[PDB]
Design an enzyme around this catalytic site. Structure first.
Site: not given
Ligand SMILES: C=C(/N=C/c1c(COP(=O)(O)O)cnc(C)c1O)C(=O)O
Ligand SMILES: C=C(/N=C/c1c(COP(=O)(O)O)cnc(C)c1O)C(=O)O
Lengths: 378, 383
Positions: A76, A109
């Site tokens: 991220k 999250d």
């Molecule tokens: C919504 C979140 N999570 C995203 C995330 C995602 C999903 O990414 P998108 O929300 O860009 O689809 C996939 N893999 C991991 C390890 C992630 O932390 C967040 O970090 O708040």
């Protein structure tokens, strides 16, 4: 053992192959130029799971290990830090090529807020990060560990996102949120562009291997990563000659249900509610198929990656990180393996790229899955 | 998470510290000297799980990885090959300390996997014949392993003990040489050598601990009939004395013959194939009755937990492929850790921050099917 995990595959009937210059080779090269200048930069490993490829009936399974992304244990960081740098380079009239070394708000999250917190610390600025109820303490602690303000609420992520909005407009914070909505697109665009660095790395890494990926599996929450990474990959490999499969959890399959309908319609990170419009647009255009899979498919992925087959390299992968690889594993042990493999066009010549988007960001859950066998196949 | 797997501990009320001269350092030296003369010999790794010991609140967890033993994925050949060479030295009046290279003999045994494989392999190496018997429900992969060495393999309609008796009969009927890793009335000589052959791994482990500069306070020994435990503990207490070693015997719930023998002080299906027991090995029992500190009767899922913990290590610890029977000793440590009554169980087992715990990973993924069901599918999960 032979077992049937829910893995609903649906062809994208709205596929047109319209690429996005907004997410391309050129922009990702600017995004990568930025990240390269950050202290302790290293392209994350592209792991070749050869023995698992031979067991699954494909040529190559290749996993981008985003658990190595600096010390953040997730990918991220690539988006958030770029958007924050772009936001300042706009406000303080500068060029993105020079990287000489006030408050950013967001709901997360887990990973996205850690990226925003890390970037704020690196640039001396402040950060206030909101988290929904039920969120892991370790993930809270890691944000406080970076010197930011972390508040855990009593409402769901979609409801918590409104709280961050009403607070940032009333106090004067700059919202660095990883999703778009009407009247807010500038930052999420940069975020998706910042993500593409991993696809740029993986492409350079694949060329060094001398292979050409036929497939890509992308997990989706709001679809910001899927959008940014797919948009880059199809700019490199064409939307027609890359079989892209978007993978969502069963209880938050917003992009699947959006692809099913046409218009806009569990493992932390992949929760949705409402899809990111910037991401959706790219997936609606260029994504080959959408998969809606059972919760335990992710759990399987984590175990397969954390205890590899034959002599393959071991990878530490979290619930949201391992679900793409899990799909491949769930397909292998399914009684309908033959027809599932055909539907996904997976064969002896298939070269499969997988993105391990995070490592053991929640150690308690990670070890409950891989040692205790929580969310077992049974 | 916090969970309660059945882990019953019993102090050995019959402990007396009487060692056995038949299992000592000198007879382990002769065993190991023999093994070093065999092609492909390499001491098996002793892996230091430093980060898991930290997590578990002990000083050192050291795992003897017997999956690396002569390409056979298990330790069992150390005894089988040694007994067989000794028999050849009786038949041809040869000196064992001098011979190394090379009438046709046939070696016969019952096994539920590794022992027969060890026997079959040794017969192949020395250009002899082997006929191996197997109890009903034996994994096809293990049947194949023996066949792939050029030996005969038969899966019977009977349990282990009855199949052993059928092996005895057929051997008398055809003139075979029975090479069984258990003892009974009128058959003790060969399982003695077999037990002596096993001490090679403990000899290596003691040498390896010495190179690390550590001293074990504990040893966990898994048991089927107790040949391995008996042979290995017998050597170890000759090194460290019965009193300075907190030795724990580990058995599966459905076949805890040595545990039940433990509580009473007299000789009395599991996922841990290898640890099944109808009648205990009386030769092993004498050593355990004497020098074993404690006996543990535990749930099947405890082995499964061990398998997963070993195959997906904590922190930076080395990865170990460990099978159902191979992992249960480790699994005990992991089960105790997550137990509500952890503190009391740790105290009971005299495990604290100074404990240097030796664990024997007796086999790797000998059943690849089941192994991956445990570590990937989460078969025999905690919940
Ligand atoms: C919504 C979140 N999570 C995203 C995330 C995602 C999903 O990414 P998108 O929300 O860009 O689809 C996939 N893999 C991991 C390890 C992630 O932390 C967040 O970090 O708040
Ligand atoms: C009974 C057998 N196995 C015993 C065994 C044992 C138990 O050893 P004793 O039978 O010597 O107790 C421990 N670990 C492994 C991997 C084993 O295969 C056999 O190989 O036929």
């Amino acid at each position: 053992s032979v077992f049937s995990l829910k893995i609903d595959i649906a062809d994208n009937k709205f596929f047109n192959g319209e690429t996005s210059p907004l997410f391309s080779q050129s922009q990702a090269k600017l995004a990568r130029q930025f990240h390269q200048k950050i202290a302790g930069y290293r392209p994350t490993p592209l792991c070749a799971l050869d023995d698992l490829a031979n067991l699954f009936g494909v040529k190559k399974i290749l996993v981008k290990d985003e658990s190595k992304r600096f010390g953040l244990n997730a990918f991220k960081m690539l988006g958030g830090a770029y958007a924050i740098a772009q936001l300042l380079c706009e406000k303080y009239h500068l060029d993105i090529e020079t990287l000489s070394f006030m408050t950013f708000a967001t709901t997360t999250d887990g990973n996205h807020g850690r990226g925003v917190a890390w970037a704020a610390q690196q640039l001396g600025q402040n950060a206030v990060i909101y988290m929904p109820k039920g969120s892991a303490q370790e993930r809270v602690d890691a944000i406080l560990n970076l010197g930011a303000e972390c508040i855990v609420t009593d409402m769901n992520y979609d409801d918590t996102v409104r709280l961050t909005m009403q607070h940032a407009q009333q106090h004067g914070w700059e919202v660095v949120q990883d999703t778009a909505w009407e009247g807010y697109t500038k930052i999420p665009t940069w975020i998706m562009q910042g993500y593409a660095t991993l696809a740029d790395e993986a492409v350079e890494q694949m060329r060094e291997m001398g292979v050409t990926p036929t497939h890509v599996l992308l997990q989706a929450g709001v679809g910001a990563m899927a959008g940014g990474v797919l948009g880059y990959l199809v700019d490199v490999y064409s939307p027609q000659n890359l079989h892209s499969i978007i993978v969502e959890p069963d209880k938050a399959d917003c992009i699947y249900r959006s692809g099913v309908k046409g218009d806009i319609v569990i493992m932390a990170g992949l929760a949705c509610g409402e899809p990111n419009p910037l991401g959706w647009e790219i997936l609606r255009n260029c994504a080959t198929q959408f998969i809606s899979c059972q919760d335990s498919v992710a759990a399987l992925g984590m175990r397969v990656l954390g205890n590899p087959y034959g002599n393959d390299p071991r990878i530490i992968s979290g619930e949201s990180g391992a679900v793409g690889l899990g799909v491949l594993a769930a397909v292998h042990y399914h009684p309908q393996r033959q027809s599932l493999m055909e539907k996904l066009a997976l064969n002896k010549d298939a070269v499969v790229l997988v993105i391990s988007t995070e490592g053991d960001t929640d150690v308690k859950h990670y070890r409950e899955v891989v040692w205790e066998g929580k969310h077992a196949v049974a």
